[PDB]
Design a binder for this molecule. Structure first.
Ligand SMILES: Nc1ncnc2c1ncn2[C@@H]1O[C@H](CSCC[C@H](N)C(=O)O)[C@@H](O)[C@H]1O
Ligand SMILES: [As]
Length: 330
């Protein structure tokens, strides 16, 4: 019904999740994973938008390690006061519990984290911004995405899970608070998403995972007849030199190990240890300016060879976003 792990949980996250307070997991309902299984998180500052009971906040906590930091934001006392419960519990995980926790919880609206109350979230403080089945619920999406842009460091990354549509919803369906409350009503047409995040400073969206979402309950399915709701997990890097098109300047880039046998960046790129792999300029700028430069040697720009076609799905790479997400999902 939208808000439920609409894919399997990744392996590494399971080991952890076992150890997460069961209360936090009874409650909790987002479409799939909003946190990489890269291994790329040690020492990061992660912010969660609409964190609720803090499932993702506490999973991030273990992932970042004792010396990274997590900040869940949520608008509701009732959701926050549940997650605050287990700060100390989950400090066992770091051995020295009642003291060793990274996490903290701010109360505020995600469209404005500068007024989040315990304390605000200043400009350029965050490495990763996550969210699990929450952004579809915003009222001013452009405002939200700009806000996210204000708060990431340069080379930082919006990496998040949310529910998206085949097509714009009818004027009617927009209004229905039942539909909206099931995290379907507010969901975005994939092409309007891309348009917005770009309007807001993110010109390069990359799709990690797509999930079938089905309304079944036909009291709803009437207002959205031919719609096909999705659950997509998207990374958008904050990097000033990205263009809206994946141009090719001759560069390869090579994963050096440190994490696993291979680093998998998106559906299109998989760098295994010490094997160079050709990339478009954006993909290079991402690696260079993000936290990734440390596991990554990256060739120099050369001559422009027009649109990047060095990939075996290059056709699709350049396709609209709707088409990308029909083809994966089939
Ligand atoms: N405009 C807004 N500002 C801040 N938080 C919001 C919001 N609209 C909805 N939320 C929060 O969004 C959450 C949707 S439920 C998802 C909670 C969490 N991501 C999980 O998977 O458990 C709720 O906890 C709600 O409090
Ligand atoms: As939801």
């Amino acid at each position: 019904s939208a808000c439920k792990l609409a894919a399997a949980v990744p392996e590494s996250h399971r080991k952890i999740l076992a150890d997460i307070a069961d209360e936090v997991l009874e409650k909790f309902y987002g479409c799939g994973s909003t946190l990489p299984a890269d291994g790329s998180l040690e020492g990061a500052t992660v912010l969660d938008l609409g964190c609720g009971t803090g499932r993702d906040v506490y999973l991030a906590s273990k992932l970042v390690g004792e010396h990274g930091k997590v900040i869940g934001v949520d608008m509701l006392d009732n959701q926050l006061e549940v997650a605050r419960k287990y700060v100390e519990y989950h400090a066992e995980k770091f051995f020295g519990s009642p003291s060793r926790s990274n996490v903290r919880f701010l109360k505020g609206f995600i469209e404005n984290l500068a007024t989040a109350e315990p304390e605000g979230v200043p400009d350029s403080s965050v490495d990763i911004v996550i969210s699990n089945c929450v952004c579809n619920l915003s009222t001013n999406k452009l405002a939200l995405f700009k806000e996210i842009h204000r708060v990431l460091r340069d080379g930082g990354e919006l990496y998040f899970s949310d529910v998206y549509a085949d097509r714009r919803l009818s004027e009617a369906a927009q209004q229905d608070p039942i539909l909206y409350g099931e995290c379907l009503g507010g969901a975005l047409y994939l092409e309007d998403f891309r348009r917005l995040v770009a309007e807001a400073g993110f010109r390069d969206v990359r799709l990690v995972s797509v999930g079938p979402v089905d309304v079944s309950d036909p009291q709803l399915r009437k207002l959205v007849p031919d719609v096909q709701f999705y659950s997509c997990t998207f990374r958008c890097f904050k990097v000033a030199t990205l263009e809206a098109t994946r141009e090719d300047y001759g560069q390869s880039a090579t994963y050096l190990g440190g994490i696993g046998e291979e680093f998998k960046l998106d559906r299109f790129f998989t760098f295994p240890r010490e094997k160079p792999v050709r990339v478009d300029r954006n993909t290079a700028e991402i690696i260079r300016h993000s936290r990734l430069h440390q596991w990554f040697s990256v060739s120099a720009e050369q001559q422009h060879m027009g649109l990047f076609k060095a990939n075996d799905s290059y056709a699709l790479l350049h396709a609209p976003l709707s088409m990308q997400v029909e083809q994966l999902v089939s």
